[PDB]
Amino acid sequence: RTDLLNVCMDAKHHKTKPGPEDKLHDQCSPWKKNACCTASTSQELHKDTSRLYNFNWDHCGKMEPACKRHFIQDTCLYECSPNLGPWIQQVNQSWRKERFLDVPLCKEDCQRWWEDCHTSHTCKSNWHRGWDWTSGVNKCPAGALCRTFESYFPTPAALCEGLWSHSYKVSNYSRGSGRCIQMWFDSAQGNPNEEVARFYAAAMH
Ligand SMILES: CN(Cc1cnc2nc(N)nc(N)c2n1)c1ccc(C(=O)N[C@@H](CCC(=O)O)C(=O)O)cc1
Ligand SMILES: *[C@@H]1O[C@H](CO)[C@@H](O[C@@H]2O[C@H](CO)[C@@H](O)[C@H](O)[C@H]2NC(C)=O)[C@H](O)[C@H]1NC(C)=O
Ligand SMILES: *[C@@H]1O[C@H](CO)[C@@H](O[C@@H]2O[C@H](CO)[C@@H](O)[C@H](O)[C@H]2NC(C)=O)[C@H](O)[C@H]1NC(C)=O
Ligand SMILES: [Cl-]
Ligand SMILES: [Cl-]
Ligand SMILES: [K+]
């Protein structure tokens, strides 16, 4: 149980162990007291088609700012959170040894993300597997047309759950309940996800 608290998963850019990073950039700054990401990672992850995975958000024309801020935020959580131990699973992949499964995302964060992305476009309902990477950057593969976000993600759950192969599930608990993981939080009273990781480590046991 306690073994699941305050760890970093074994993945491409993660630090070995959580620790302070006073210089976390922009949207990742709320993790600055305790983070699995380096300052340099936090900086690079804000960029379009960044060097972290050469991943292009603007694969079906430009993704709108109100939408892209959520993908940036989600990447801060993925690369920086020391509070997702309870959901870590082993995986066979060339670029990471572990990933997350069924992280209980607060329903409002999923809802807000889905809504803010309605005016954006994509060509796939799962962005973890199946891209054409032959150019060095992800491109829509054979059979995959550009459509409205809603076409590929007809509900908030389809976005948050389908996007990274069920790395999230949409919790029925709300932001602030201490019973779901917040993607978006300010740090004034601490990182609220610590208490959540603590609760589920024991509750899932
Ligand atoms: C967006 N990005 C970084 C990345 C990867 N996994 C995540 N997982 C979660 N839960 N959240 C993220 N933000 C996240 N981000 C990506 C996306 C695709 C590939 C990729 O190489 N996909 C190959 C699959 C490679 C493989 O066989 O493992 C493909 O088929 O398209 C790498 C990094
Ligand atoms: C990663 O790969 C290994 C090896 O293929 C998987 O383990 C095997 O699983 C099968 C059943 O699916 C067993 O019969 C074999 O004995 C296992 N082989 C070894 C070498 O352990 C493993 O399950 C994979 N991990 C995931 C999450 O799929
Ligand atoms: C998720 O949470 C909502 C809100 O807390 C739950 O809502 C209510 O459910 C009961 C009985 O099903 C109703 O009588 C109430 O009027 C509902 N409130 C609202 C505002 O809808 C909901 O049941 C929960 N979902 C699950 C699957 O447990
Ligand atoms: Cl590389
Ligand atoms: Cl706003
Ligand atoms: K966190």
Count: domains in the chain: 1
Cα 74 to ligand 4 centroid, rounded to whole Å: 21
Question: Is residue 134 within 6 Å of ligand 2 at its C-beta?
Answer: no
CA distance 107 to 178: 13
Residue numbers of the domain that contains 1 = 1-205
Give the number of whichever ligand sits closest to the CA of residue 91. 2
Question: Is residue 19 within 6 Å of ligand 1 at its C-beta?
Answer: no
Instruction: Kindly provide the resolution of this structure in angstroms, with one decimal.
Output: 2.1
Please name which of 80, 15, 82, 6 lies closest in space to residue 42, comparing C-alpha atoms: 80
CA distance 161 to 126: 9
Question: Is residue 81 within 6 Å of ligand 1 at its C-beta?
Answer: no
Give the number of whichever ligand sits closest to the CA of residue 106. 3
Q: In three state form, how does the secondary structure of 43-111 look?
A: HHCCCCCCCCCCCCCCECECCCHHHHHHHHHHHHHHHHCCCCHHHEEECCCCCCCEEECCEEECHHHHH
**Exposure letters 156-176 (e unless 16+ CB within 10 A, then b):** bbbbbbbbbebbbbbbebebe
φ and ψ at 98, to 5 degrees? Answer: -140, 160
Are 191 and 30 in contact by the 8 Å Cβ rule? The answer is yes
Please name which of 183, 191, 145 lies closest in space to residue 164, comparing C-alpha atoms: 183
Residue entry with tokens 């020391």: 82
CA distance 175 to 73: 15
Residue entry with tokens 């809802």: 111
CA distance 63 to 6: 33
CA distance 172 to 161: 13
Question: Is residue 164 within 6 Å of ligand 1 at its C-beta?
Answer: yes
CA distances from 46 to 51, 65, 136, 163 (A): 10, 12, 19, 19
Residue entry with tokens 């050469």: 54
CA distance 35 to 182: 15
For residue 53 the two structure tokens come to: 């995975």
Ligand 1: which of 69, 128, 159, 181 to mutate, judged by most atoms within 8 Å of the beta carbon? 128
